[PDB]
Amino acid sequence: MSQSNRELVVDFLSYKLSQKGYSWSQFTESEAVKQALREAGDEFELRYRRAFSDLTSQLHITPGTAYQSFEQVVNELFRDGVNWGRIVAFFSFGGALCVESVDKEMQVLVSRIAAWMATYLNDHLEPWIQENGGWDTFVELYG
């Protein structure tokens, strides 16, 4: 479902904004997915992210930025195709984009990034997810 993905994105972003000191007011199997994803994002940010180039310096979102610009940049996470670890990085990257947005007084962009993330997730990532056991398999691995 594309609506459960939308909830999933919103859940992750709300968690990230709260954790980092900002307002989140910008907008069971499912809870198991959200919690494992929140947890995996923290782990990635804490231990893994710094091994890579900072993808946020490739993208400066303003109210005029088009989806396609976001899409092209996120595409780099998937230069070698999709795996769960890059999917997790994808969420963290969205969260970082949102934190930076709220920080520079462009909090309106948070809901747009959310929409962008759901769109990107629904067409580029979801086919690999369904092929590789769906989100329940993610919970088995990362929960």
The reply on whether position 27 binds ligand H0Y by CB under 6 A is no
Could you tell me the smallest distance in angstroms from the CB atom of residue 48 to ligand H0Y?
A: 6
Q: Rounded CA gap, 95 and 107, in Å?
A: 12
Q: Can you count the helices (H) and strands (E) in the chain?
A: 7, 0
Q: Rounded CA gap, 79 and 67, in Å?
A: 18
Could you tell me the smallest distance in angstroms from the CB atom of residue 101 to ligand H0Y?
A: 13
Binding ligand H0Y (rule: CB under 6 A), the pick from 17, 55, 98, 102 is 55
The reply on whether position 83 binds ligand H0Y by CB under 6 A is yes
Q: Where are the beta strands (DSSP E) in the chain?
A: none
The reply on whether position 56 binds ligand H0Y by CB under 6 A is yes
Q: Which residue has the tokens 């972003």?
A: 13
Residue 79 one-letter amino acid: R
Binding ligand H0Y (rule: CB under 6 A), the pick from 54, 123, 136, 140 is 54
Could you tell me the smallest distance in angstroms from the CB atom of residue 131 to ligand H0Y?
A: 17
Largest CA distance in the chain: 40
**By the criterion CB under 6 A, which residues form the site for ligand H0Y?**
48-49, 52-56, 76-77, 79, 83, 85-86, 89, 92-93, 96
